[PDB]
Amino acid sequence: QVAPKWYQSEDVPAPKQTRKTARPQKLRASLVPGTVLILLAGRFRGKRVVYLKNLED
Amino acid sequence: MAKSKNHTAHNQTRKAHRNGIKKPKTYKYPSLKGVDAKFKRNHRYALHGTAKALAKA
Amino acid sequence: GKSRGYRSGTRYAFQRDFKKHGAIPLSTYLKVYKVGDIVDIKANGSIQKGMPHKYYHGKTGIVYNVTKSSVGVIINKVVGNRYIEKRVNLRVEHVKHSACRQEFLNRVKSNAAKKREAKANGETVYLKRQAAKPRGSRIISTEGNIPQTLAPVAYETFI
Amino acid sequence: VLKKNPLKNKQVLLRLNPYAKAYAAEKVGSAKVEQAKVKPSKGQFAEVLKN
Amino acid sequence: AQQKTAEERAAAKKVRKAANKEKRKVIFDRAAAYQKEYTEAERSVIKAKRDAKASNSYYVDAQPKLVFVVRIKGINKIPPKPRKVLQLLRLTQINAGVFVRLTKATSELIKLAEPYVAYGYPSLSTIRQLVYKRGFGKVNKQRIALSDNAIIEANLGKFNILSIEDLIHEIYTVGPNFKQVSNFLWPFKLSNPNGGFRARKFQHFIQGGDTGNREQFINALVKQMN
Amino acid sequence: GRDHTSKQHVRSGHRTAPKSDNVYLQLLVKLYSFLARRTDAPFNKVILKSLFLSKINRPPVSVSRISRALKQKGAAEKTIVVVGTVTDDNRLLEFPKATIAALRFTAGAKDRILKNGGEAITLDQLALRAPKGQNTLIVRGPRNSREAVRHFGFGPHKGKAPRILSKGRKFERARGRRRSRGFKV
Amino acid sequence: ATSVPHPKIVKKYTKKFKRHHSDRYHRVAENWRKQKGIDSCVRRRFRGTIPQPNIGYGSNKKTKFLNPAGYKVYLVKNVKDLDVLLLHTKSYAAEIASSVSSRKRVEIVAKAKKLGVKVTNPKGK
Amino acid sequence: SRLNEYQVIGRNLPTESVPEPKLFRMRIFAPNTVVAKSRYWYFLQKLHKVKKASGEIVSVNIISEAKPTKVKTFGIWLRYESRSGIHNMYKEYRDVTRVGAVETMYQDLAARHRARFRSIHILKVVELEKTDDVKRQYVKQFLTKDLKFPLPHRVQKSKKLFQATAPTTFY
RNA sequence: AGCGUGCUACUUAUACUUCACCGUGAUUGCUGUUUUGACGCUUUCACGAGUAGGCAGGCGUGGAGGUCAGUGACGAAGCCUU
RNA sequence: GCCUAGACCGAGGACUGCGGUUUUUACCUAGGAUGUUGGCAUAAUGAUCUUAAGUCGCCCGUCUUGAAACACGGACCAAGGA
Ligand SMILES: [Mg+2]
Ligand SMILES: [Mg+2]
Ligand SMILES: [Mg+2]
Ligand SMILES: [Mg+2]
Ligand SMILES: [Mg+2]
Ligand SMILES: [Mg+2]
Ligand SMILES: [Mg+2]
Ligand SMILES: [Mg+2]
Ligand SMILES: [Mg+2]
Ligand SMILES: [Mg+2]
Ligand SMILES: [Mg+2]
Ligand SMILES: [Mg+2]
Ligand SMILES: [Mg+2]
Ligand SMILES: [Mg+2]
Ligand SMILES: [Mg+2]
Ligand SMILES: [Mg+2]
Ligand SMILES: [Mg+2]
Ligand SMILES: [Mg+2]
Ligand SMILES: [Mg+2]
Ligand SMILES: [Mg+2]
Ligand SMILES: [Mg+2]
Ligand SMILES: [Mg+2]
Ligand SMILES: [Mg+2]
Ligand SMILES: [Mg+2]
Ligand SMILES: [Mg+2]
Ligand SMILES: [Mg+2]
Ligand SMILES: [Mg+2]
């Protein structure tokens, strides 16, 4: 077997500086508060519901 | 019983062009082999006298 | 039986030109050949001494030796994958000065004259030869030359 | 490490060609041509119709 | 130490940027002038055609001085002379493209390679798209992307080519340094056409194939392949 | 596929290292790898290449060659550099005072050089007194004087030496070497 | 991964390169052998024949020799053999030799646990 | 093919002997201008001691239909090659464009004589102004007064594979 | 769903384009920070079919010099085993 | 010039460069993926083995221009074998 050498370091380098500055989400023109929506997934799939507000999430 | 191929030049230009066809090198002074003996004989004396004159100068 | 003699296959190559048989005009014997001259080789069938082999018929080479009635010519011949230097002794009846020298030597003289005159006039000149370029724009006048319309012709038999 | 197309990346386009900014600002791609309303084929170029 | 060298780097970069501003102004002016002369030449040719039409004459266009040659044939079963010709045109793979300045010598070259290539007269926008998307330079016998004008300057600055637009101009208006600029350009490696070829490539464009001179449809083909 | 205009994956055909496993020659290659990589002096690149050469490509340099090279005009005080062995020459009538840097010296060569007031230094001492090879003069020995080269390119009318074990009148002198025995080539 | 961080480990070929007709004959073992026959469909690479070993399948040099846990495995036969992994406990794991006795293996496991060295075969005897 | 009608004008290259050579025009039915100039030189070397190398193309222009929405009858004079010989023929076509009549002609000789594009020379395309100029009955039958005809047995194309009702062909 | 001809779309090779990884060849730099690997590290680009054949780098076996103060009756070697 | 639908990929790993906006020795989309949320860690995930299904796959070695050949050697296995 090949023994480890002294020059085989274990230090973890820092990541490079990422240039992925986030920009805001752009919603479809059809999504306006007060619009009746149809839920497609989840527990309440198939339910017609009222759209009220666009959260920051 | 032993009738075979007689002659063929097939593949001979391919083999000649793998490493050829190389032109001969040129030099400033060609060999005086085959040049007239009387001329070569006198040209020897002419060069010897020219070398003497340039050496003295 | 195969025959591979010295002059095999030279029936038309070594023939004299039509209505050009007989004695050799003496400018052939008055030309002067110097070592380094470029000469064409063309066997004259009426002189059988100093005759080239059929390979050298039509080849051009450098004079390297001058003897009483002959010149030595250097030819490069392909033998397999390289060239071999061949040294052929030819009587001057089978030799003629190559006309490519006088043209290149004239372009050299013309370039020297144009360059010196351009220097005298203080301008620049480009001496490299150029290939033929595509032609420029132009206007075709139709006064007296209104276009004539052609059509493909019907089929006819003329016998 | 990664080639970016100047025809897609505007930053690379400006890095290579600073004049793209002026071309866009001046609308060179949709420039109108001012000229007179003429028709120079009314005469002998009607040789195209027949000959 | 790292923060110290950062301050020095910041100062040196300040000075470098100040110096580069003038060079970028120069290349900006050059690009604007090239655009002006392109537009003027187009309008001049249009005006000449209209004038010849008015004066009962016929304006004959200047014959094209530039051609873009694309090798559309594979590397198998090529006779020695067109094979050597394609090698001397640097078309040693399928879909390789090169710019050729038309003379008698180059026209007789292209005629030998005609059954294996599609070529034509490229427009300015086609040249620009080729150089921008697939432009590479031959630097120390290596294929280097033309991603910055410094790469072009370091290799063609002795020929007064300082920008990608200088290079494009030198190609388009076949210039005094066309040889150096086009040989610096690595052969363009195009994709296959989006939309395909005609039903059978290897017959002349006149006979419904793809090889030979198509003369302005090289732009549509290049749009397909680039 | 590619239409290859040249052979693919071809090694340069030049030595990039000594074939020798001598550690001290490896140290010399280290020193001149650094000098050639960092001094811009063409001398250091030539010395680095010469340290890779095989034994027949570094023929011995006689002390007579060094004497003749020092007799060039304006070369009397140059440093003679021999990447190889410097041998003695008992045919010299006299040897000058000279500085010579070599891989090896024979006992007679070194004795003569030091006897005449000169120096016999190594290439590492050279790299300190002349790190750019200033005022040096590289001397190489004769390569075509080797005995093996006598038989290279043998053929008709080539004039080279036949590969033969014995020499005498009965060994390859009759037919093909004499017109009285057929032909001569 | 509890080891030094690495890119996701990719094995280009995960099956075993089995010698041709090691399935047909018992005398032909599965150990890979290159077909040298003049007419061989495998040597000539006919469609449908077996894959063959070539350098294209070589592993990424950054993930080569790492087990699925991200460690390089070093064979250990005694407690003094663990000393070479002191400064490499997050990139090298110890594997106790099969011929180590149950006593010495207990000592190796105890010392490896003390040193923080991971052991690839921590259970056997 | 899908064709256009081109006016191609060319001439011999000017010489110091002849500095204004005669201009020759041809009407070429070609898919594009590359084939238009090729066909031009093809017919000029059948009619004159000229080549593309010794000649010059002076003008290429599209000739548009004068009345593209007026129904016409065209007579086309042809010279085509068969498997055995060379024949002259004259045929008639009904169309609103001269180009579309030539396109119909090429389809028609492909269908009735197996004559390919390369085997056909169009000698002449003429719009027949008078109803008496029409010689062929297969186009003369559409020049009768108050022409009416139905289209019996209409086949309707379905979007679906299966149909729940019986097919019909009324129309 | 045949024959002649034109057109549009579409299907897909180990071919072409972009990207990842392996190797080969070339190539950039690395010693007052060379720093216990310089036969090393590192930058960049191109390339990869192969019988006969050549060369290179490796895997495995019996025995020998040296070394691991190596494993082993608390189980060596051998053998069987998703 | 503008708007708009989808797919595959994320190599690199402190900084350094070229540009852009400059409200600024600052910021950016500009020398290669980040942010956020959920679930899981008795498991979603991966590998191998057996088997089914789809698709492809003729018996190796040899001499030969040409072998799956209606050419030759080979029933099987171990040890020896140039
Ligand atoms: Mg034979
Ligand atoms: Mg004759
Ligand atoms: Mg006689
Ligand atoms: Mg598509
Ligand atoms: Mg097709
Ligand atoms: Mg390849
Ligand atoms: Mg004997
Ligand atoms: Mg005798
Ligand atoms: Mg075979
Ligand atoms: Mg059909
Ligand atoms: Mg694919
Ligand atoms: Mg290979
Ligand atoms: Mg082999
Ligand atoms: Mg033994
Ligand atoms: Mg023990
Ligand atoms: Mg055991
Ligand atoms: Mg990454
Ligand atoms: Mg099958
Ligand atoms: Mg046999
Ligand atoms: Mg036999
Ligand atoms: Mg046989
Ligand atoms: Mg067989
Ligand atoms: Mg059979
Ligand atoms: Mg038998
Ligand atoms: Mg037999
Ligand atoms: Mg049997
Ligand atoms: Mg055995």
Q: Can you walk through the features of this model?
A:
The structure is cut from a larger assembly and holds eight protein chains of eight kinds. Chain B is 49% helix and 0% strand. With 57 residues, chain B is mainly alpha-helical. Chain B starts with 11 loop residues before the first helix and ends with a helix. Chain G has one helix and three strands. Chain G is largely without helices or strands. Chain G is elongated and about 60 Å long. In chain G, strands 1-2-3 form a three-stranded parallel β-sheet, with helices on one face. With 171 residues, chain H is α+β, with helices and mostly antiparallel strands. Chain H is built from three helices and six strands. A three-stranded antiparallel β-sheet of chain H has the order 2-1-3. Chain H has a three-stranded antiparallel β-sheet with strand order 5-4-6, with helices on one face. The chains are: A little secondary structure (57), B mainly alpha (57), C alpha+beta (159), D mainly alpha (51), E alpha+beta (226), F alpha/beta (185), G little secondary structure (125), H alpha+beta (171). The interface between D and E is medium-sized, with 21 and 23 residues. The structure holds two RNA strands.
| Helix fraction bin of chain C | 10-25%
Shape of chain C: extended
Number of strands of chain C: 7
Task: Report strand % of chain C.
Answer: 25-35%
Largest interface: D-E, 21 and 23 residues
Radius of gyration of chain F equals 22 Å
Taken in chain order, the helices and strands of chain C follow as HEEEEEHEE
The amount of helix of chain F comes to 25-40%
Sheet having the most strands of chain C: 5 strands, antiparallel
Total of helices of chain F: 5
Distance between the termini of chain C: 50 Å
What's the assembly state of these chains? Answer: part of a larger assembly
Q: Helix and strand succession of chain F?
A: HHEHEEHEHE
Query: First CA to last CA of chain F: what distance?
Result: 51 Å
Specify the overall morphology of chain F.
flat
Strand content of chain F: 5-15%
Number of helices of chain C: 2
What features would you highlight for this structure?
part of a larger assembly; 8 chains; B: mainly alpha; 2 helices; 49% helix; F: 185 residues; alpha/beta; five-stranded parallel sheet; binds magnesium ion; Ribo_uL30_ferredoxin-like_sf (chain E); Ribosomal_uL30_euk (chain E); ribonucleoprotein (chain E); metal-binding (chain E)
